[PDB]
Design a protein around this motif. Structure first.
Motif, PDB file in Angstrom:
ATOM      1  N   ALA B  31      30.001  24.929  30.808  1.00 34.66           N
ATOM      2  CA  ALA B  31      29.380  25.219  29.519  1.00 34.66           C
ATOM      3  C   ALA B  31      30.258  24.778  28.358  1.00 34.66           C
ATOM      4  O   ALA B  31      29.744  24.412  27.292  1.00 34.66           O
ATOM      5  N   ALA B  32      31.578  24.795  28.548  1.00 30.49           N
ATOM      6  CA  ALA B  32      32.483  24.391  27.482  1.00 30.49           C
ATOM      7  C   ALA B  32      32.229  22.948  27.070  1.00 30.49           C
ATOM      8  O   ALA B  32      31.975  22.657  25.896  1.00 30.49           O
ATOM      9  N   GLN B  33      32.253  22.032  28.033  1.00 22.26           N
ATOM     10  CA  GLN B  33      32.021  20.637  27.695  1.00 22.26           C
ATOM     11  C   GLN B  33      30.555  20.369  27.412  1.00 22.26           C
ATOM     12  O   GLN B  33      30.240  19.383  26.747  1.00 22.26           O
ATOM     13  N   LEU B  34      29.654  21.222  27.900  1.00 23.90           N
ATOM     14  CA  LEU B  34      28.269  21.139  27.451  1.00 23.90           C
ATOM     15  C   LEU B  34      28.190  21.290  25.942  1.00 23.90           C
ATOM     16  O   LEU B  34      27.607  20.447  25.243  1.00 23.90           O
ATOM     17  N   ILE B  35      28.786  22.363  25.425  1.00 25.16           N
ATOM     18  CA  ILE B  35      28.862  22.556  23.983  1.00 25.16           C
ATOM     19  C   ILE B  35      29.578  21.382  23.341  1.00 25.16           C
ATOM     20  O   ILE B  35      29.147  20.853  22.307  1.00 25.16           O
TER      21      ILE B  35
END
Lengths: 52, 52
Positions: B31-35
Motif C-alpha cells: 500500500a505504501a508504494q501504491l500511494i
C-alpha cells in the motif's frame, strides 16, 4: 516542471531577437543599396591606406 | 506421552501465526508504494496544471 517553464520563456526571449536582427539587417542592406556614394568609396579606400 | 507430543502442536500453530504476519507485512507494505505511485501521478497532475 518549473524549470521547463523557465527554459521555454528564455527560448522565446532569445528567439524574437533573431527575426528582429534579420529585419534590421534587411533594412541596412536596402539602405546601403540605395547608397550610391563612390565618394564614400574613395574616402574609405583612403582610410584603409592610412590604416595600412 | 501423548500430552508431551501435543505441546509441539502449539509451536506449529505459533509458526503459522508468525507466517501470517509476513502476509500482512507484504500486503500493507504494498500500500505504501501504491500511494507513492498514485500521488506521483498527482504530481504529474500538478505538472500539466503547470503546462496549462
Amino acid at each position: 516542471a518549473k524549470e521547463a517553464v523557465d527554459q521555454e520563456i528564455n527560448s522565446a526571449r532569445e528567439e524574437l531577437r533573431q527575426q528582429v536582427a534579420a529585419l534590421a539587417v534587411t533594412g541596412a542592406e536596402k539602405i546601403l543599396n540605395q547608397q550610391v556614394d563612390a565618394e564614400a568609396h574613395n574616402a574609405m579606400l583612403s582610410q584603409l591606406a592610412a590604416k595600412l | 506421552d501423548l500430552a508431551d507430543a501435543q505441546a509441539q502442536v502449539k509451536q506449529e500453530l505459533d509458526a503459522a501465526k508468525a507466517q501470517a504476519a509476513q502476509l500482512i507485512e507484504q500486503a500493507n507494505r504494498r500500500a505504501a508504494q501504491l500511494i507513492e505511485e498514485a500521488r506521483t501521478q498527482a504530481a504529474a497532475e500538478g505538472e500539466r496544471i503547470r503546462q496549462q
